[PDB]
Amino acid sequence: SLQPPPQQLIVNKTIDLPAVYQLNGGEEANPHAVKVLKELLSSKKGMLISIGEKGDKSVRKYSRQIPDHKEGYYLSVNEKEIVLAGNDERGTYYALQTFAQLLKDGKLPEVEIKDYPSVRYRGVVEGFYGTPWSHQARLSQLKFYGKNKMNTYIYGPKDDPYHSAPNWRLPYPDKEAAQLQELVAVANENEVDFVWAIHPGQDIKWNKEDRDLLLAKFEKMYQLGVRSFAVFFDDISGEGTNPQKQAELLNYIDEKFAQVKPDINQLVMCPTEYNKSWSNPNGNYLTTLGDKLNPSIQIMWTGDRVISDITRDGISWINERIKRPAYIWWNFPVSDYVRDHLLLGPVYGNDTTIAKEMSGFVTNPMEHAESSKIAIYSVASYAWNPAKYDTWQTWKDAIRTILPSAAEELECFAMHNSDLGPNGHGYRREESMDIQPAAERFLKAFKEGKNYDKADFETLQYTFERMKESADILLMNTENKPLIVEITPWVHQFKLTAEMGEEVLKMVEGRNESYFLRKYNHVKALQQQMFYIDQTSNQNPYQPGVKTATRVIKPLIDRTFATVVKFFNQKFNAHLDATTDYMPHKMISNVEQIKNLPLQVKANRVLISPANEVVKWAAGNSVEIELDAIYPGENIQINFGCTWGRLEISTDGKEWKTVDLKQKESRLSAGLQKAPVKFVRFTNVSDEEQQVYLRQFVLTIEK
Ligand SMILES: C=CCNC1=N[C@@H]2[C@@H](O)[C@H](O)[C@@H](CO)O[C@@H]2S1
């Protein structure tokens, strides 16, 4: 209804937008708010509309109703008068943003509102690894922040070469500089502080030469319009991690630059130890920063872990040490460590009562800018009014705002694209919770030979139908073309999941052998299509491919497919393959966890899925990979957790050529030097059983 929800709102009657109005204070009030107001409109005889900041003539009558907080405002609508009065210029702009949401069909509700943020700095840090947001995406983002009362945008793409090492020393070229100039201007028009960050720690020298280069870079950005600045020391090693040096540098920028210019706003640093588990208690890095860094300077913090939600105990832990309220860097929805997943679910987990305990709250988003508006909108609501923060309603409101013409379809898509999957940070999100109980019940019964509930079967049927509807509708949506460009690969994979799910359910209901077999063949072809999408879309270097509906739906479908094929093989004494993911290559083994470990293709690599359990490698047993063709080989790398095995390659499986594995901490490796390869074979040739841990088994070929 109103986002963010105001601190104070008074319920009844309806007032039409005055066809004739008298404007009071258009020449004294925030020009950015006036422009918004004249846009919403279209003389002295008419109804009075008072706009202005506390102190202006236009609103002196309502001085006692205007909240005495920065960015606060007072809004009133009744039959005779409209009041739009901020405590300051940004507060007046934020009054117009709320006013704009109130306007419906030219009709306004009779309301009185007192409002202001609970958290002083609220917004976004473009701080991820990956392709930095496009210029057109950044322009759209700033307008979005202004509409949602987010007042902070911290520019810091890790892979922008003029942000980080070594070319943080170099001024932006004319083209990029002109774009940053535009960004800064658009930010100002939308009441957003543009904070330009620099990331010099990996190669900074603690000498005068690098100090001066950093300040000269800051001066250039200031000439481009930048009035807020940040220095990042995250994700570095070496002398740059020295807290005393970091604090002296930031205090120098403060005293010789930030407090020398007339109009610099935020000065922010992010530390090397930026979460609790990365803090070494055997030293005292954080208390050195807390005590030496000038108190006006902000210190960023991601929580108890690199990826974590903010708790009351956690914020108190850090605050005691840095001697000031932490400026939260919240690592959601950033996906740069799970780049084959979209993270489109609700924003939750952050304590709603600790607004006084944080200096700021910013979200690190996905490199998918439009897709991140779901989380950004929700953080905007949370940060402005946490006590009233409504996780699910705000998620639904965000989707309806981003894609009104297809909000139900985006909800369906987002609901099943929210978990991260397994990852090194251990961070997960709920997903598909609506249908998860019916999936769990259906699969337990089916596996056990008990009757499943008809209602559960139909819930699954319904889900797959709605998934196909939503996929096809989103693909053709033209209301937010940039969004659809971002999600399309996942949309394609999402539809394929839904079609597969339908066909497996028909295998469950199947009543004759011929019909079952058509469905089985259809499922296999769909598996092959998902493999194709996984290999040709989103081919980034770290987590290539496209994964969707991974927490609940894909396991349901795969396990149901496997179970019904097992039942068919039993019933008809048949030997249908029950594999659930297409794999063009083959692998066979006499060792067994390995025999059932699936191969994977990632870029030009062919690898055995690593396991976690003990692999007992018997005396004579082996593992042999057979590729679907002859390829020029690059290397083989193995990791067993070696005077017992023998690595051989071949083009025909008859004539073999032994390859010698080189040993090292990084472990068993061997170059192939473009030799043709189709078969790789690893055979235990010693006499005692050798138990191992397959951490990796990877062949790389030239494509
Ligand atoms: C307060 C400092 C936090 N800085 C961080 N730098 C890194 C970010 O650039 C990543 O996007 C993020 C997710 O992979 O992990 C850490 S968090």
Tab-separated table of N, CA and C and ligand atoms in Angstrom, residues 127-129 158 234-235 270-271 274 300-302 306-307 329 331 334 336-337 364 425, ligand 1:
chain	number	residue	atom	x	y	z
A	127	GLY	N	28.993	-3.670	-5.102
A	127	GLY	CA	30.270	-4.113	-4.578
A	127	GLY	C	30.657	-5.536	-4.909
A	128	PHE	N	30.064	-6.085	-5.963
A	128	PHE	CA	30.204	-7.501	-6.268
A	128	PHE	C	31.350	-7.735	-7.237
A	129	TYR	N	31.786	-8.993	-7.297
A	129	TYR	CA	32.576	-9.504	-8.415
A	129	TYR	C	31.690	-9.876	-9.597
A	158	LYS	N	33.982	-4.629	-7.992
A	158	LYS	CA	35.321	-5.189	-7.796
A	158	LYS	C	36.109	-5.294	-9.094
A	234	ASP	N	38.791	-4.644	1.675
A	234	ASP	CA	38.242	-5.989	1.771
A	234	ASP	C	38.897	-6.916	0.747
A	235	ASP	N	39.101	-8.172	1.152
A	235	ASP	CA	39.554	-9.239	0.250
A	235	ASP	C	40.954	-8.961	-0.311
A	270	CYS	N	35.706	0.242	4.489
A	270	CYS	CA	35.328	-1.114	4.827
A	270	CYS	C	36.593	-1.874	5.205
A	271	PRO	N	36.610	-2.560	6.342
A	271	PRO	CA	37.867	-3.101	6.864
A	271	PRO	C	38.249	-4.434	6.217
A	274	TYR	N	36.090	-7.966	8.158
A	274	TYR	CA	34.786	-7.339	7.985
A	274	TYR	C	33.614	-8.206	8.453
A	300	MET	N	32.247	-0.398	7.685
A	300	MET	CA	31.286	-1.351	7.155
A	300	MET	C	31.502	-2.732	7.749
A	301	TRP	N	30.441	-3.535	7.714
A	301	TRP	CA	30.413	-4.790	8.447
A	301	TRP	C	29.349	-5.674	7.810
A	302	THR	N	29.674	-6.956	7.569
A	302	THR	CA	28.751	-7.890	6.927
A	302	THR	C	28.060	-8.829	7.904
A	306	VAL	N	30.843	-13.767	6.490
A	306	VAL	CA	30.890	-13.051	5.211
A	306	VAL	C	29.483	-12.866	4.652
A	307	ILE	N	28.676	-13.941	4.678
A	307	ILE	CA	27.270	-13.921	4.270
A	307	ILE	C	26.455	-14.233	5.519
A	329	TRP	N	26.934	-3.739	5.519
A	329	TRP	CA	27.053	-4.236	4.145
A	329	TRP	C	26.428	-5.628	4.152
A	331	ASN	N	25.147	-8.939	2.466
A	331	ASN	CA	25.458	-9.697	1.255
A	331	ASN	C	24.268	-10.546	0.809
A	334	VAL	N	23.485	-10.663	-3.440
A	334	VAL	CA	24.678	-10.916	-4.256
A	334	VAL	C	24.827	-12.413	-4.521
A	336	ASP	N	27.545	-13.644	-6.651
A	336	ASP	CA	28.775	-13.785	-7.416
A	336	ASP	C	29.592	-15.010	-7.012
A	337	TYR	N	29.153	-15.748	-6.000
A	337	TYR	CA	29.740	-17.020	-5.632
A	337	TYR	C	28.788	-18.175	-5.894
A	364	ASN	N	24.336	-5.462	-1.072
A	364	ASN	CA	25.190	-5.832	-2.192
A	364	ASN	C	24.366	-6.717	-3.125
A	425	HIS	N	30.063	-20.689	1.656
A	425	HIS	CA	29.681	-19.788	2.736
A	425	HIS	C	28.600	-20.361	3.633
B	1	LIG	C1	32.306	-4.754	4.679
B	1	LIG	C2	32.995	-5.353	3.727
B	1	LIG	C3	32.396	-6.489	2.922
B	1	LIG	N1	33.126	-6.639	1.685
B	1	LIG	C4	33.050	-7.741	0.950
B	1	LIG	N2	33.727	-7.930	-0.111
B	1	LIG	C5	33.373	-9.127	-0.899
B	1	LIG	C6	32.305	-8.708	-1.897
B	1	LIG	O1	32.898	-7.971	-2.970
B	1	LIG	C7	31.575	-9.927	-2.447
B	1	LIG	O2	30.563	-9.494	-3.358
B	1	LIG	C8	30.939	-10.661	-1.294
B	1	LIG	C9	30.125	-11.852	-1.816
B	1	LIG	O3	30.995	-12.760	-2.501
B	1	LIG	O4	31.958	-11.118	-0.404
B	1	LIG	C10	32.822	-10.105	0.141
B	1	LIG	S1	32.062	-9.035	1.342
